[PDB]
Write a protein that binds this DNA or RNA. Structure first.
Ligand SMILES: [Mg+2]
Ligand SMILES: [Mg+2]
Ligand SMILES: [Mg+2]
Ligand SMILES: [Mg+2]
Ligand SMILES: [Mg+2]
Ligand SMILES: [Mg+2]
Ligand SMILES: [Mg+2]
Ligand SMILES: [Mg+2]
Ligand SMILES: [Mg+2]
Ligand SMILES: [Mg+2]
Ligand SMILES: [Mg+2]
Ligand SMILES: [Mg+2]
Ligand SMILES: [Mg+2]
Ligand SMILES: [Mg+2]
Ligand SMILES: [Mg+2]
Ligand SMILES: [Mg+2]
Ligand SMILES: [Mg+2]
Ligand SMILES: [Mg+2]
Ligand SMILES: [Mg+2]
Ligand SMILES: [Mg+2]
Ligand SMILES: [Mg+2]
Ligand SMILES: [Mg+2]
Ligand SMILES: [Mg+2]
Ligand SMILES: [Mg+2]
Ligand SMILES: [Mg+2]
Ligand SMILES: [Mg+2]
Ligand SMILES: [Mg+2]
Ligand SMILES: [Mg+2]
Ligand SMILES: [Mg+2]
Ligand SMILES: [Mg+2]
Ligand SMILES: [Mg+2]
Ligand SMILES: [Mg+2]
Ligand SMILES: [Mg+2]
Ligand SMILES: [Mg+2]
Ligand SMILES: [Mg+2]
Ligand SMILES: [Mg+2]
Ligand SMILES: [Mg+2]
Ligand SMILES: [Mg+2]
Ligand SMILES: [Mg+2]
Ligand SMILES: [Mg+2]
Ligand SMILES: [Mg+2]
Ligand SMILES: [Mg+2]
Ligand SMILES: [Zn+2]
Lengths: 127, 140, 211, 100, 224, 83, 100, 115
RNA sequence: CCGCACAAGCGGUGGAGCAUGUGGUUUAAUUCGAUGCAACGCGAAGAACCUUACCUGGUCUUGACAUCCACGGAAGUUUUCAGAGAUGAGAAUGUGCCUUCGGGAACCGUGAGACAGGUGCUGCAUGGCUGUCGUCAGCUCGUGUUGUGAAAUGUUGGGUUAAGUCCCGCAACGAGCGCAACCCUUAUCCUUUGUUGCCAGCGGUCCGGCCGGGAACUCAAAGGAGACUGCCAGUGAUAAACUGGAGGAAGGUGGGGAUGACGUCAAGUCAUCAUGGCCCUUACGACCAGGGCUACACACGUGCUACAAUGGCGCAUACAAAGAGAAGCGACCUCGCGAGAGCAAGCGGACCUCAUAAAGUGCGUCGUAGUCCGGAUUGGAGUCUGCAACUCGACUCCAUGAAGUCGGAAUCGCUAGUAAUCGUGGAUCAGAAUGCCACGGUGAAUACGUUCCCGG
């Protein structure tokens, strides 16, 4: 038996496999802390298990690529949420109330002509 | 604005302590999007505060802030076609925001060897009601 | 308030291109130059034949040219006597074997270009401009039963100060992209200078894509 | 662009084409690491004698249609103006306004 | 229809004395409770003559148009007309119905065009929103023109519930010269009604009596 | 500047002129337009009239100038002060 | 054993898919064994030019060219197949490359 | 500690200290330390006298301060008297290697004064 | 009745050095155009020669560039002298090809004219193209209707919107150009195909998806599905519409782009090109070398880097996107402190190369200083492109360490993946990006409100 989830955030994407186990996790063949110096990312990724108190019952195998550390973290969180819904759909209601189910769509905006940044324009001459 | 008005934006709770107020604090302290630097500074300052001033960390922070919160300001409205320098009671959100802004602005000035140290000193004084954010309240 | 080119926007939506040959960077620029020379020749020779458009292809190292005119007989000649000369000369300048095909424009009134060239000719013969506009427009409405607009500007009637007048009938929904707007312009020289002419001819709505 | 300009350009391209090989060989000699000093000296001296316009560097791209010396694109060999109008005609295969 | 039936139906009601209308005094029954009253015995002969005229018109297959703009009467006029297969207006009277019918013809054309698309079901070709949009537009057109889409031209004669509230239709009728059969009441002028039907224009029971009598007259006359 | 693998640079015609002059001992100035050539030691004691866009400027060569470009001793712009 | 690999490029996606349609149906009716048409990432160039004869720095437009790719692989080049697929020809707009 | 004639390096990382010598940048400073075989980060204090002596001998290899200044002066004087373009723009106190002068020459021209 | 118009917030400009444009001055020359906004990193997506239109000097006169006639010779190749070069003078040389067998086609030279040539003038003679009000919500017609007419209604009124968007009322009913929609792009799922892309479950492995194998997953690119106030509650004149809630990847134009109504400014461009017409033909046309467009008491606009411990320096170690490549991109290995050099594989490119992202994180150090901040300027010594880097290129090493410690009056930008901050790619291009056009990483604050400034 096994269950799967796919997550995305900014330019990143992640594949998540979840299985009954004592709670060990690996990301790109590295431990979570080895893959993330910043202390925030670790909760950011573990919050779904905390929310349903599953932390010690499922083992995780993770592969992720694209985007930065923050985007990856978000992608993994989303993937874990989906994986959990596959495992037990009754979790859907509380997972949505937590806001974990929603696909954040915010992405960078393209530069435009005459603007040295998206919505940034040179100082007025004031003549 | 002329056509419309809208509510303020939601923010996450602090991931270490679960308080949104502390997250707002780190945001006002943040510069150039270096959030990790700001949060390291804030965590170290609160840690040294708890071990040297007060009994507990988040509680020490909250009491130091409470010793400072302004209630009233004179910032203007003009509906009559002429400017009002009218004293008006302040919403709690703005109370906290003004207090936080003032304390960080003072820490920038205090001038100790490091920002975590400046911040801890200002905050310890604020818990002692001597942190000059009290003065920034009092002048208003 | 300058407007965009009606044909350009609708390319790849309802309008197909006039040149559909593939090439790589090592050949693109000179392919384009050869196409330019070919058209620049054919227009000069076929001025009298009332030619509308020329579409060029380069399949299998050979150039194939298709011409749309309102009256083939003038260009095709007796027993293909003269078209053969065109084939030879285009083969020469293109540097490849050449193939020519003729398509017959059936309603010259509803062709933007032909209308414009008629107007330019009439102007060059000092026919009063607005009369020509009126007759052109009314003919368009009689046959095509869909909107038309005409624009003329320059030193009209030899007036000291140049100016522009224009005329419309029916729907001309430019901002719409489904609209099968036919657009073109033409030129007329006079003793006084240049008088431009532009024409739009709506012909209905396309639903289901150019496919 | 005055006719003289395009005349100069065509003359440069032709003449430069002519002496391509000889210049290449003498460059090979001049740059060689182990060449005798006297040989390199002679080669350098002799290079001067060739017509200056022989060097490819002196050429300037100009619009095929008009010969404008600015706003050139190698892809089409045309200036920013003529390429734009020709595009609007739709004579360039597969070119379309970009909205991404 | 007789005088006491009319009284029971409230045909004799009028309006409370109101300013500046001494024109109606001739033939006023009277007044009570500060409201004027109509003479039903003028009505009986006039009303019967109106019905006789309508019977004659129906016998020659005249196209009666039933216009009701007085609120309560709009659905009743629709019922009466459709019972008779006749055309009707049950909304605000669009000014220029007759004088500007030239324009109305095009609305009829486009109504039928969209209806034909409906039978075709080709709205499915469109993007979902535009399909719904065309459907809604068709719904509005049906709502407005449904009662006249089959009329095909200017009608022969007009039935009017109340001169006091359809007065624009009276103006157009006079302009073109189309006979008007209408209820005429206190606070209303017989001017512009060719075959006046004296009687109260307000009471819904009176309206019911009028409409029943008129529809019966139409079908009896066209059936002789 | 010029690579050392390349070696110094000089225009041929100038070389022939200076060689002929020095072997002849004519010792009178040499009109030239070659601002871009480099001074070799054997040219010491000569005089070169170097074109400056307008006029050929006399110049007397001495050992300190060896290795300099000829043009470096003939200013092309003029200036005497805005005021 | 042998294997034929064919790469197709064009600017009209529909046109090139049609091309693949003919190629594959011929490979079938001739009885060869085929790997299905594999799409490959499509390149797109973009250009921009000032639209005004007398310049306004702000005023410029943008254009792009899209070139699509399809790939087909034949792992059973039966003899009659080999020549047959060189008997086929495609529209002008389609560029074909075959290799063994 | 006194080195290279009259220099008295302050007590800091030996490298930062030595740079004080006019003519000794960071690179030369590391070179000297490496040659002397001394750790770069030791204070200028707690050197034995012999260690400072080996450092004196080390620095004796490079051009001492006074002769370095003299050689700079002689080079510039040679350019000045040679009368070449670079000498002219030295004597006129203007940028010497091709910078624009319609603007942006204050470091060479000095602070602004009215025309 | 509204808008980053003000207010509320954040960060800059105005002081310093330097890059760049303009004005003035200067010069033989500093070629020309552009001027409130809506000129000033602007035409120019790239001036050492060339470019180049300016200056000095040296040369040609049917001509550099095109047709027409005559005459003479294939062409072309190699090479010598004079001259800065343009050119001039010579040498050998070629000596050919179709030839109906006449010659001709080829080219090249001289002569004769008709003509060539012009970045010369007029954007107030014009076409074409573009900016501006302004992505502002308006601009009009037909039929009908009212006034003796000049005209008016529609298009005003009460609501409601981003909107002349929609509902009600209403002497008006409609229509057209605008608005919205149809197009590209992004957010979720489904179908199809699986190499050069993919590796969940299997077998082997030196542990390298490395290879046997797999068609799951990511991803690739074609076609589908999906959001409409559809559902619920309240509100409202039962109107439209508004407020909240459910579900859902996404909720009320989901987000961004393209798309610019009638007209205003005799706005800009005769130097892209086209053209009316006026002017110059041994010269206002043409060729060549050197100079200049880069000057310098000045001052104005737009930028880049700083004045530092939220930092500087040393060591170790993570995570992208989007592009380009055939005279091209160029690995590997060897040499140099370094820019680089030698050798040389691969790839027309999901395969090969450019090319290891920086902020980040771990360790140490510096201790508030004109500093282990800052880097301008100058001396010495080198590499690379190019015939050639003096005027006048970029880059490397050593040495040298200005001014500058948060900046007046006053003023500019920004409402969310935005501001701020950190890197990568591309065009022009032998060489020459602090400019321009794109790509991603991290990632905020504030908005009472409309009165004042401002503009519909
Ligand atoms: Mg919800
Ligand atoms: Mg436009
Ligand atoms: Mg060049
Ligand atoms: Mg040097
Ligand atoms: Mg700009
Ligand atoms: Mg309005
Ligand atoms: Mg403000
Ligand atoms: Mg400044
Ligand atoms: Mg100043
Ligand atoms: Mg100028
Ligand atoms: Mg010579
Ligand atoms: Mg002659
Ligand atoms: Mg002229
Ligand atoms: Mg002007
Ligand atoms: Mg103008
Ligand atoms: Mg003007
Ligand atoms: Mg209006
Ligand atoms: Mg709008
Ligand atoms: Mg509308
Ligand atoms: Mg109305
Ligand atoms: Mg295995
Ligand atoms: Mg599959
Ligand atoms: Mg799709
Ligand atoms: Mg929607
Ligand atoms: Mg909701
Ligand atoms: Mg949109
Ligand atoms: Mg959308
Ligand atoms: Mg639109
Ligand atoms: Mg001019
Ligand atoms: Mg020159
Ligand atoms: Mg300039
Ligand atoms: Mg430093
Ligand atoms: Mg990478
Ligand atoms: Mg490049
Ligand atoms: Mg090495
Ligand atoms: Mg590529
Ligand atoms: Mg690179
Ligand atoms: Mg670091
Ligand atoms: Mg140094
Ligand atoms: Mg200082
Ligand atoms: Mg940057
Ligand atoms: Mg960014
Ligand atoms: Zn009544």
């Amino acid at each position: 038996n096994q269950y799967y989830g796919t997550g995305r955030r900014k330019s990143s994407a992640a594949r998540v496999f979840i299985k009954p186990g004592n709670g060990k996790i690996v990301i790109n063949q590295r431990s979570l802390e080895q893959y993330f110096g910043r202390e925030t990312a670790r909760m950011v990724v573990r919050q779904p298990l905390e929310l349903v108190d599953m932390v010690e019952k499922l083992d995780l195998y993770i592969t992720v690529k694209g985007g930065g550390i923050s985007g990856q973290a978000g992608a993994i969180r989303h993937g874990i949420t989906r994986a959990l819904m596959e495992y037990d759909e009754s979790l859907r209601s509380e997972l949505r109330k937590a806001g974990f189910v929603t696909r954040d769509a915010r992405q960078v905006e393209r530069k435009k002509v005459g603007l040295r940044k998206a919505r940034r324009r040179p100082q007025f001459s004031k003549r | 604005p002329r056509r419309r008005v809208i509510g303020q934006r939601k923010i996450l709770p602090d991931p270490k302590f679960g308080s949104e107020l502390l997250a707002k604090f780190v945001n006002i302290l943040m510069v150039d999007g270096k959030k990790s630097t700001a949060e390291s500074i804030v965590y170290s300052a609160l840690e040294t505060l708890a071990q040297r001033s007060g009994k507990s960390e988040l509680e020490a922070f909250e009491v130091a802030l409470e010793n400072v919160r302004p209630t009233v300001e004179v910032k203007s409205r003009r509906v009559g076609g002429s400017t009002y320098q009218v004293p008006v009671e302040v919403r709690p959100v703005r109370r906290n925001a003004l207090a936080m802004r003032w304390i960080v602005e003072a820490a920038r000035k205090r001038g100790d060897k490091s920002m975590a140290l400046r911040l801890a000193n200002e905050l310890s004084d604020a818990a002692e009601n001597k942190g000059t954010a009290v003065k920034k309240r009092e002048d208003v | 308030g300058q407007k965009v080119h009606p044909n350009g926007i609708r390319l790849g939506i309802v309008k197909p291109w006039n040149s559909t040959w593939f090439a790589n960077t090592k050949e693109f620029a000179d392919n384009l130059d050869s196409d330019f020379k070919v058209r620049q020749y054919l227009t000069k020779e076929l001025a009298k034949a009332s030619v509308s458009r020329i579409v060029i292809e380069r399949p299998a190292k050979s150039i194939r040219v298709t011409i749309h005119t309102a009256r083939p007989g003038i260009v095709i000649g007796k027993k293909g006597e003269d078209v053969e000369k065109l084939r030879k000369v285009v083969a020469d300048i293109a540097g490849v074997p050449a193939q020519i095909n003729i398509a017959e424009v059936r309603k010259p009134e509803l062709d933007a270009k032909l209308v414009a060239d008629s107007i330019t000719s009439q102007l060059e013969r000092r026919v009063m401009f607005r009369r020509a506009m009126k007759r052109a427009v009314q003919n368009a409405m009689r046959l095509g039963a869909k909107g038309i607009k005409v624009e003329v500007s320059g030193r009209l009637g030899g007036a000291e100060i140049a100016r522009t007048e224009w005329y419309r009938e029916g729907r001309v929904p430019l901002h719409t992209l489904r609209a099968d707007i036919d657009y073109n312009t033409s030129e007329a020289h006079t003793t006084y200078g240049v008088i431009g002419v532009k024409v739009w001819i709506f012909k209905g709505e396309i639903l289901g894509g150019m496919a | 662009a005055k006719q003289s300009m395009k005349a100069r350009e065509v003359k440069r391209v032709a003449l430069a084409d002519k002496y391509f090989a000889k210049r290449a060989e003498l460059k090979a000699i001049i740059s060689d690491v182990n060449a005798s000093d006297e040989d390199r000296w002679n080669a350098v001296l002799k290079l001067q004698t060739l017509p200056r316009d022989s060097s490819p560097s002196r050429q300037r791209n100009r619009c095929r249609q008009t010969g404008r010396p600015h706003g050139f694109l190698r892809k089409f060999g045309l200036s920013r103006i003529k390429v734009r109008e020709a595009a609007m005609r739709g004579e360039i295969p597969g070119l379309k306004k970009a909205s991404w | 229809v007789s005088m006491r039936d009319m009284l029971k139906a409230g045909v004799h009601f009028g309006h409370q004395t109101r300013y500046w209308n001494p024109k109606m005094k001739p033939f006023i029954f009277g007044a009570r409770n500060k409201v004027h009253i109509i003479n039903l015995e003028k009505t009986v002969p006039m009303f019967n003559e109106a019905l006789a005229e309508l019977n004659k018109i129906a016998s020659r297959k005249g196209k009666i148009l039933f216009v009701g703009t007085k609120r309560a009467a709009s659905e009743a006029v629709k019922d009466a007309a459709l019972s008779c297969d006749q055309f009707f207006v049950n909304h605000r009277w669009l000014g220029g119905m007759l004088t500007n019918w030239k324009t109305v013809r095009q609305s009829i054309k486009r109504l039928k065009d969209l209806e034909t698309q409906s039978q075709d079901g080709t709205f499915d070709k469109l993007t979902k929103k535009e399909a719904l949009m065309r459907t809604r537009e068709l719904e509005k057109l049906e709502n407005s023109l449904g009662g006249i889409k089959d009329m095909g031209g200017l009608p022969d004669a007009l039935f009017v519930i109340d001169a006091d509230h359809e007065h624009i239709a009276i103006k157009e009728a006079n302009n073109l010269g189309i006979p008007v059969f209408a209820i005429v009441d206190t606070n209303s002028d017989p001017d512009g009604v060719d075959f006046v039907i004296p009687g109260n224009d307000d009471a819904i029971r009176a309206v019911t009596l009028y409409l029943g009598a008129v529809a019966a007259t139409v079908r009896e006359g066209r059936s002789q | 500047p010029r690579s050392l693998k390349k070696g110094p640079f000089i225009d041929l015609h100038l070389l022939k002129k200076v060689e002929k002059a020095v072997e002849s001992g004519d010792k009178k100035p040499l009109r030239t337009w070659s601002r871009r050539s480099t001074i070799f030691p054997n040219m010491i004691g000569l005089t070169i009239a170097v074109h400056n866009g307008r006029q050929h400027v006399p110049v007397f060569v001495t050992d300190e100038m060896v290795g300099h470009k000829l043009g470096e001793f003939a200013p092309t712009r003029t200036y005497r002060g805005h005021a | 054993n042998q294997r034929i690999r064919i790469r197709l490029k064009a600017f009209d996606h529909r046109l090139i898919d049609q091309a693949t349609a003919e190629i594959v149906e011929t490979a079938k009716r001739t009885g060869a064994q085929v790997r299905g048409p594999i799409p490959l990432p499509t390149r797109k160039e973009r250009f921009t030019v000032l639209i005004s004869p007398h310049v306004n720095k702000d005023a410029r437009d943008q254009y792009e060219i899209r070139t699509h790719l399809r790939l087909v692989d034949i792992v059973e080049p039966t003899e009659k197949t080999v020549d047959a697929l060189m008997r086929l020809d495609l529209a002008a707009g389609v560029d074909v490359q075959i290799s063994l | 500690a006194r080195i290279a004639g009259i220099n008295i390096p302050d007590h800091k990382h030996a490298v930062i200290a030595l740079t004080s010598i006019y003519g000794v940048g960071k690179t030369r400073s590391k070179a000297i330390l490496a040659a002397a075989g001394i750790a770069e980060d030791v204070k200028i204090s707690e050197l034995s006298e012999g260690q400072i002596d080996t450092l004196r001998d080390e620095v004796a290899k490079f051009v001492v301060e006074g002769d370095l200044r003299r050689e700079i002066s002689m080079s510039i004087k040679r350019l000045m008297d040679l009368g070449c373009y670079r000498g002219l723009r030295h004597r006129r106190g203007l940028p010497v290697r091709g910078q624009r002068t319609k603007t942006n020459a204050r470091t060479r021209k000095g602070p602004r004064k009215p025309i």
